[PDB]
């Protein structure tokens, strides 16, 4: 009986948490008793009838006394398509934590179940320290809340990529990352972890939950036991409690590579044998190429390394069919040079620009850049995308170059996926649908390949959109900023061939204007009078 296995393994406290999440996500408090009811059945489960019945079927059959037409695993695919003083007073603590847990679980669908359990334990720790503390619980709580929202966005990515593309693509992704993370490990060890990681991910994307928490626990078990062959950065991670220990290995930094590593060229470009090796064990052979390239290059995005492996694969497929293969693929490393330099220059130019402008004007510059490229997107969407891209700048450009491409990749991949989700439910651009459609190694390059839209006809002048009101002085910095960034996008839609010099001079005018009248004694009068000098300034610059 699986329900028993996982009872015996997960525990009781963890089992109950796990049932709390999936059930909650599927149904949108009344049936919380049913989750405590399931535990009583589980004790019953461990030759009783209804016991050893399939886990999903028992959950699938039940909750649906929301289609419910076939109640099978082929239905699940259809289903997937469809106050400091008071907080301490609750501190039955177990009840208080459980309500807190439901609420996070209720809020987002694709949260990775295993991670959710971990944050709760940190939340308890802060309360236990805080009540003894004369008052800083709120900063610890804020810390944890901010981290969670991003995970739901990355997970959506992972699962869609697995549906979009086969496990071969997901395993390859994994091989690339773990080689970076665990360079001193040999290939057979890395391969072992990826198969395990894939199953745990494949299942939670499946939404079984159930085993992946047990499979995550076993995987975390395995590493700490076998540190000798994995990473010299695992020690501390591997002295913690289980949910902390596990979540911690997800976050562990890159280990140093072995010193005096050989060049990959012998055995991948210098050997007569490679077409034979490729024919004897193709995907293994290619897997090992990626292992060797990756472990030498923590300064590379995973996707980049996937392009290189792809390039190499394409080169063997043509070269090994040619007259003298050895000659034909002798130059292949010269092919990798431009693939590596395109992302590096792009990081170089955009950080140069961010450094010299600061977050806010950087955002303004991106706003100009992407409006011209895709003027048909709605103004609120252009503002949010550009705003988020700017923050990517501030998070990544701080790091030296060696750390930049993986950081960019990390955050930019979530932006581009959120963006593509929006575009699907209200398309406005064929170029964007295509960049969203294309293979993951090509998504970002395709977006990078967008040009200005020379067909776009200017928006007619409207006066309201470029007038500010005194109420703007009451707003937070974020909302005031958005106000002006809305004007800028609208300015570009009205003057789409104006230089970025003229466009920025006006945007600074918007800034100087709001700055000046928000200091004035009589604001209402400043906003009306100086409002004329702004109109004459933009007219001077742009007409």
């Amino acid at each position: 009986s699986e329900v028993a296995h996982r009872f015996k393994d997960l525990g009781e406290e963890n089992f109950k948490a796990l049932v709390l999440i999936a059930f909650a996500q599927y149904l949108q408090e009344d049936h919380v008793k049913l989750v405590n009811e399931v535990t009583e059945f589980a004790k019953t489960c461990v030759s009783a009838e209804n016991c050893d019945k399939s886990l999903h079927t028992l959950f699938g059959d039940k909750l649906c006394t929301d289609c419910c037409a076939k109640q099978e695993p082929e239905r699940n695919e259809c289903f997937l398509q469809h106050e400091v003083d008071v907080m301490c007073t609750a501190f039955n603590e177990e009840t208080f934590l459980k309500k807190y847990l439901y609420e996070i679980a209720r809020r987002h669908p694709y949260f990775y179940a295993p991670e959710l359990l971990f944050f709760a334990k940190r939340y308890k720790a802060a309360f236990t320290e805080c009540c003894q503390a004369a008052d800083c619980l709120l900063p610890k709580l804020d810390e944890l809340r901010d981290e969670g929202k991003a995970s739901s966005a990355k997970q959506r990515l992972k699962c869609a990529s697995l549906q979009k593309f086969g496990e071969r693509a997901f395993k390859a992704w994994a091989v690339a990352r773990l080689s970076q993370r665990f360079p001193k490990a040999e290939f057979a060890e890395v391969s072992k972890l990826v198969t395990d990681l894939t199953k745990v991910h494949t299942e939670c994307c499946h939404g079984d939950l159930l085993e992946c928490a047990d499979d995550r626990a076993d995987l975390a078990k395995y590493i700490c036991e076998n540190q000798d062959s994995i990473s010299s950065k695992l020690k501390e991670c591997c002295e913690k409690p289980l949910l902390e220990k596990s979540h911690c290995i997800a976050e562990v930094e890159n280990d140093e590579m072995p010193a005096d590593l050989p060049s990959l060229a012998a055995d991948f470009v210098e050997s007569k044998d490679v077409c034979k090796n490729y024919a004897e064990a193709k995907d293994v052979f290619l897997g090992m190429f990626l292992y060797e390239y990756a472990r030498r290059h923590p300064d590379y995005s995973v996707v980049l390394l996937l392009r290189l492996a792809k390039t190499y694969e394409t080169t063997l497929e043509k070269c090994c069919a040619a007259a003298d293969p050895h000659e034909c693929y002798a130059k292949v490393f010269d092919e990798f040079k431009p693939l590596v330099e395109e992302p590096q220059n792009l990081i170089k130019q955009n950080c140069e620009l961010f450094e010299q402008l600061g977050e806010y004007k950087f955002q303004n510059a991106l706003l100009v850049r992407y409006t011209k490229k895709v003027p048909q997107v709605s103004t609120p969407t252009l503002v949010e995308v550009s705003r988020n891209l700017g923050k990517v700048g501030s998070k990544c450009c701080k790091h030296p170059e060696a750390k930049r491409m993986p950081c960019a990749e990390d955050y930019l991949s979530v932006v581009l996926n959120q963006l593509c989700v929006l575009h699907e439910k209200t398309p406005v651009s064929d170029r964007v649908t295509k960049c969203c459609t294309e293979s993951l190694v090509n998504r970002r390059p395709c977006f990078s390949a967008l040009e200005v839209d020379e067909t776009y006809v200017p928006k007619e002048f409207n006066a309201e959109t470029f007038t500010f009101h005194a109420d703007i002085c009451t707003l937070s910095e974020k909302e005031r900023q958005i106000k002006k960034q809305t004007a800028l996008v609208e300015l570009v839609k009205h003057k789409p061939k104006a230089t970025k010099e003229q466009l920025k001079a006006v945007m600074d005018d918007f800034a100087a204007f709001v700055e000046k009248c928000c200091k004035a004694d009589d604001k209402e009068t400043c906003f009306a009078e100086e409002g004329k000098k702004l109109v004459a300034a933009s007219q001077a610059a742009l007409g």
Partner: nanobody
Amino acid sequence: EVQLQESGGGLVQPGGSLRLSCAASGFTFSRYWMFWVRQAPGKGLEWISDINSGGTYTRYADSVKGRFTISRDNAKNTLYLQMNSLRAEDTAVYYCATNSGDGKRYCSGGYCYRSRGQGTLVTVSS
């Protein structure tokens, strides 16, 4: 410097059993994986069992699972393969292999090794 050397082969018969062994030289045994791969009369290499460096993980091709066991002794630099319930189809030259060293890779039968022993012949004739 890397040296693998199989032992323990000869003629045996249906139902019976046999143990194979391999000694290691060159680089240390404890830090790497080890592999047993076989070659039946009219075939190429079948990869049949794997072991991690610490001995904490093992893998078995379907055709030998349940009946075979792989294990090691890191002190003696010695890999073992314990074979039970032998059949006709287990006839083959058994080898052992590893990916230790910075030697050339050699792919065959759907995997790649850097070093292999000279391989010991086992015959399972009724």
